[PDB]
Design a protein around this nucleic acid. Sequence first.
RNA 1: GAAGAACCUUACCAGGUCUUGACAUCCUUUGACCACUCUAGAGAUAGAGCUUUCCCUUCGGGGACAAAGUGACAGGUGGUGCAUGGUUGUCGUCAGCUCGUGUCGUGAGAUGUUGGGUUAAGUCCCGCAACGAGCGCAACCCUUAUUGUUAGUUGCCAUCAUUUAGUUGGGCACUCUAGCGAGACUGCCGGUGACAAACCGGAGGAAGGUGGGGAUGACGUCAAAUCAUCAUGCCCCUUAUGACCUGGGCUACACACGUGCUACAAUGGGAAGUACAACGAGUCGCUAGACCGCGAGGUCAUGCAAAUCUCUUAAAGCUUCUCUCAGUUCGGAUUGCAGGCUGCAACUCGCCUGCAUGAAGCCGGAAUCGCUAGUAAUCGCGGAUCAGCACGCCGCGGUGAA
Lengths: 128, 154, 78, 204, 99, 60
Amino acid sequence: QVQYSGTGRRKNAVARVRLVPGTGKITVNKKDVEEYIPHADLREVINQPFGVTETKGAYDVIVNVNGGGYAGQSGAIRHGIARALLQVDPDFRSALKRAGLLTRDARMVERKKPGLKKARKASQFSKR
Amino acid sequence: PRKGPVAKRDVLPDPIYNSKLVTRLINRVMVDGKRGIAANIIYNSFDIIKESTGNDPLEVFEQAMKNVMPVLEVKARRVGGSNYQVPVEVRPERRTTLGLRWVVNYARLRGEHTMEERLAKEIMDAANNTGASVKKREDTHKMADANRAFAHYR
Amino acid sequence: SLKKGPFVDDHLMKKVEAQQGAEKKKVIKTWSRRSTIFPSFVGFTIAVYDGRKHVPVYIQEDMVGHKLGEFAPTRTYR
Amino acid sequence: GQKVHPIGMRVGIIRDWDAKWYAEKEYAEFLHEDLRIRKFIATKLADAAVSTIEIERAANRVNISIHTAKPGMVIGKGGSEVENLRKELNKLTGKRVHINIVEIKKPDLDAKLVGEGIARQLENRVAFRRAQKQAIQRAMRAGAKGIKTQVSGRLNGADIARSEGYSEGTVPLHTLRADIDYAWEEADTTYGKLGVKVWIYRGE
Amino acid sequence: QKIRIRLKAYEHRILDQSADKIVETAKRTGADVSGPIPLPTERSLYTVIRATHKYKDSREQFEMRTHKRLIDIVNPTPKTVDALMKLDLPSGVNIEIKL
Amino acid sequence: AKKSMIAKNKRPAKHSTQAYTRCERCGRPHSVYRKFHLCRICFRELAYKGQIPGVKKASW
RNA sequence: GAAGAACCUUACCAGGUCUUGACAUCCUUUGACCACUCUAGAGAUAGAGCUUUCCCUUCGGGGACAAAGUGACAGGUGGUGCAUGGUUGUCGUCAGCUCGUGUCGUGAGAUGUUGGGUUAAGUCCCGCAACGAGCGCAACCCUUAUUGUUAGUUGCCAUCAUUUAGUUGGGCACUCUAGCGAGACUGCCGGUGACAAACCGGAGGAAGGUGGGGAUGACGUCAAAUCAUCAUGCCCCUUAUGACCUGGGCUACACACGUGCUACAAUGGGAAGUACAACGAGUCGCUAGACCGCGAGGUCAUGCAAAUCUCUUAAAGCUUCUCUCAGUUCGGAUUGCAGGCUGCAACUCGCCUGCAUGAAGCCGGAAUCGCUAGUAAUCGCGGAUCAGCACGCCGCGGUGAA
Ligand SMILES: [Zn+2]
């Protein structure tokens, strides 16, 4: 059969995006945005690559993402979305470049140092 | 800090209500970065506005910014080296900053029992010349033009 | 895990068994920390060693809930 | 004191471990055995003045290998030294063992032996100035680029401490592709504890 | 089938060159071998203070790197059995046969 | 003093909770690895020796 | 410092004993021994049972002693950091410090290292009798920031079969693991700027101007600190500054102070039901699965020498009634009863469950510290020695501003 390649990668969370041209299905491991994700399940945050270019369809998606809290494995979806819309055209990709949501924000937790208690939290220092 | 003017570090728009001063107030009320409980009390506060004597939520915030608005700014700073305080104009980002700050100041400690009684009623109250945003507006209108002329060179 | 009642260690337990068959003497120079008390010892006297000196102190009529080392303190606050 | 060994900063990077092993669940016994045999190396070091001793492991053959300039001072001549060391080391080990002896290459360059020699002159009342200056003379005759060499403590067999040291050429520490040699010796005839420290440069 | 080996050593050179040697003695006399599939390189850390008498407030850390491989051989020939039973060096990679 | 104490671990234990650990080359009972049979600072210097297989300084 | 104190880890206090001694190169029969059991104890042990028992013989030898006892002793955890090493804290990633040669001053020396702009940067140019060089910054080490080859088990399922389920056929199509790669280098353009570096701005680029972090502590200042890691100068005990055995001890309190953990409540308070991480560890230990069990507690047993099985479904999440600001449906300092666990036993001096229990505290004066972003701020898990033991430490993993 037909299936379209896609994967995401951000913040300890990897995705398996699998597009078919359809109407809009979003169930990660057969669990919907209102089944998996709780009440903060913003559609425009998720479907903003649809919501700012080729709005919207939608198109049916077999999706398999896992790892970490809800926002982290929500931010790791847009790479496979850009791959799938890229398999449509790179013509929309210049608009994606001008609208962003493509440059992966690498901001993870900064590494701690052995010698303190957090990455930057010092001692509650006295007078001396 | 010392070297030059620091980069601005702006904000993000809402998906639903589609605003950023709203979003900056969302961040100003948010404690421990816990969004979802704060999100529910945000939508509940906008729904207490919208139904109870409410036309529109953009309109009630515009009616706030009519009556909220920080207009002046006293500044206790020396250059010559003494107890010098200058009233100066308020920066526009600092104007929104002080406005949302006054909102959280009086919606935080109004004194009503349930947690968003005081929140939702004060974001009703700031729209129509009530709340301590108006009290601090009186403070701004009063203590300015008074301690000016000694620190007039600022 | 000492829920099974009596607990007096052996080369003190044979001494106190010999005390049960005889008349009640006083001094035993020992650990005095480990052997617990249980009602077949009513009226006796066994020396409790604080760390300084053994305290030959009589075993009472209603002691079951602790051991020898409550008579002589381990700090001697003064 | 704040400096760090470049031989510790570059170990396992351009050089290799002594105990070339992988010892799952039977690990520290053999390394304390390595300590035991390391206590025993005074007999070979008496004549031959070795620098490095490298040890591996077969099934039972404890593969050890030394490095010095004089084989006849450590082989005997036909096995007189070698079998006596086999017996005295078998009494330490109780197992198969094989010594290995390799000729050194420019014993002038050996930074353990240079510090050993200047400490040897410090054993018998020789002035430190001419000693470390002829050390940099023979280091120039060894052929190098820049040499630092420091001594510290009760110099001249005397009172409270001094610490000065000679330097020539060019020698950085910030470079990672350096492979600079280093050795801390003693400096002790009858007074406490002192030592010498060496910092040569040769290029990568 | 009835021969598959784990290969434990430290760094990049030993595992892959010894794996090349043993797979070349394997499919030199025979066939039926996969690749030396890498493994996630077990690691656990260490901690030592920076003083000799005092100063808990300054530590120093250490690590371990030990890469691992995996080679399968499915129903071999008796001549790579000859290559197995005699070639048992070096001991950096572990001499190790299992199921 | 400590030679009797080094000999104490070589003598068999009187019961279960008398078995303690110390280093081999020194005898420090604090901060002694049961995997290395070393104390802390002697492991430190032997790591600067690089005679311990494996362990190196780390930085990431 | 002490990364785990019931003796033990204890350096201290009380008792009992030896002081060639428990700890060192010889002295006896070499012994074959220590060994295992008996009276006793608190035991050093005294006595015993027991022999505890000869490990080549070329006519011998020595390869092996347990007290036994002798001198060289031997044992020091006793001190001098102001005899010390080595090692470590600090200014501080501050931005400096010298050398050769040429020159000015009689000289001691000065010059380079200098005036502009420019920077994390004594970075770089333009001027300048200096020319340059070396030690310095940086790079060369690691991790993350995208991805090619190489390969598929337990990673992972693609067309599909299996089917509760990647379960077993098949496979590397997502991910994954690790060798080498490629890539980011003011690299390009435009402008400001003497055209100097630098800056501003944009394209392109996953990443732009040291991409975000860790390694890296120059000369020197502080007789800083350490003789208790180690061992030495010097002094000293050396029938004890040497020891074995029984208990206490560092944890008792007339007070002051530091670092922390939790409450002072309706971003709650409780009830119910609905999910996702990573680093490790685990073969005599993680416990697979089964139950009783308010619970400390047990129950028969499988896998797991490790991408297989566990700890570990992470919590912090949702969605439904409740209490209407109350020392309280917040809170548990608090001491007795019933149990249980590691140890062998837990008053001394461990941990846990139920019962009694709601005390203070309703946001902390003078005062100060830390912080320019996954940061502060909040919540779970892993781990170091560990008979048992953390509000400790070292991480990881989520939510997320000014
Ligand atoms: Zn050690």
